[PDB]
Amino acid sequence: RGSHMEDFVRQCFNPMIVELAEKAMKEYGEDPKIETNKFAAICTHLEVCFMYSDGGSKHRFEIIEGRDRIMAWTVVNSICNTTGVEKPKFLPDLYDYKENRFIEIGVTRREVHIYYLEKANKIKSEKTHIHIFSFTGEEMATKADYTLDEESRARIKTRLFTIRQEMASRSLWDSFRQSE
Numbered sequence: 709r710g711s712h713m714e715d716f717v718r719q720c721f722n723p724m725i726v727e728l729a730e731k732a733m734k735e736y737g738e739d740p741k742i743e744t745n746k747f748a749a750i751c752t753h754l755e756v757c758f759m760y761s762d763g764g765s766k767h768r769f770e771i772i773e774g775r776d777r778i779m780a781w782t783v784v785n786s787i788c789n790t791t792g793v794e795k796p797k798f799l800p801d802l803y804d805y806k807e808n809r810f811i812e813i814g815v816t817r818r819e820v821h822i823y824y825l826e827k828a829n830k831i832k833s834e835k836t837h838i839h840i841f842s843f844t845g846e847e848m849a850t851k852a853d854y855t856l857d858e859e860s861r862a863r864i865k866t867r868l869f870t871i872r873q874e875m876a877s878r879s880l881w882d883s884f885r886q887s888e
């Protein structure tokens with residue numbers, strides 16, 4: 709039972725992102741052939757995390773997302789024993805060596821405001837920095853400190869809106885939007 713959205717995902721994102729997304733879904737027990745909207749969302753989040761880590765200086769960001777659970781926890785252990793940063797309750801997506809904080813990247817189809825709240829009660833880890841992006845182009849970050857400069861965030865926002873368009877021209881957006 710192969711969907712249009714599954715085939716759109718595979719052509720839309722690059723093969724390394726797709727395969728990491730597949731690994732992640734199967735690891736948590738989900739099927740990208742069936743949970744296709746989730747498939748699309750994991751790839752999007754992954755790509756955003758990668759573009760984010762690319763926006764800084766060379767060795768600025770450690771990438772936690774996209775790794776298998778054990779190795780992701782391993783590097784945060786090491787980050788924590790190297791920095792004395794508090795061990796987060798849940799896996800963050802990045803670590804910032806310049807500002808010395810873990811980052812949780814959010815990608816939402818609803819209001820920046822609502823999702824940001826859900827993400828802060830969900831972690832309660834006072835330490836980790838939160839950065840939300842939406843498919844319509846808005847962002848909110850902890851303490852209004854958006855970490856990267858403006859052109860890097862704008863690149864991410866542009867790609868998000870392109871994903872939205874390519875979906876909509878395939879009549880796939882409405883189903884994707886009401887899935888979250």
Ligand SMILES: O=C(NCCS(=O)(=O)c1ccccc1)c1nc([C@@H]2CCCN2C(=O)CSc2ccccc2Cl)[nH]c(=O)c1O
Pocket residue numbers: 732733736738746750753773798799800801813814815
């Ligand atoms: O990394 C995430 N989850 C795994 C690490 S975690 O469980 O420690 C955790 C959990 C929650 C937050 C950070 C960390 C992560 N999850 C999500 C969304 C909303 C929260 C749960 N959720 C899921 O999709 C769970 S299912 C799943 C998870 C990962 C891959 C595939 C599937 Cl199917 N939103 C994010 O922005 C985000 O980064």
Ligand SMILES: [Mn+2]
Pocket residue numbers: 773799800801
């Ligand atoms: Mn994550």
Ligand SMILES: [Mn+2]
Pocket residue numbers: 753801812813814
């Ligand atoms: Mn995230």
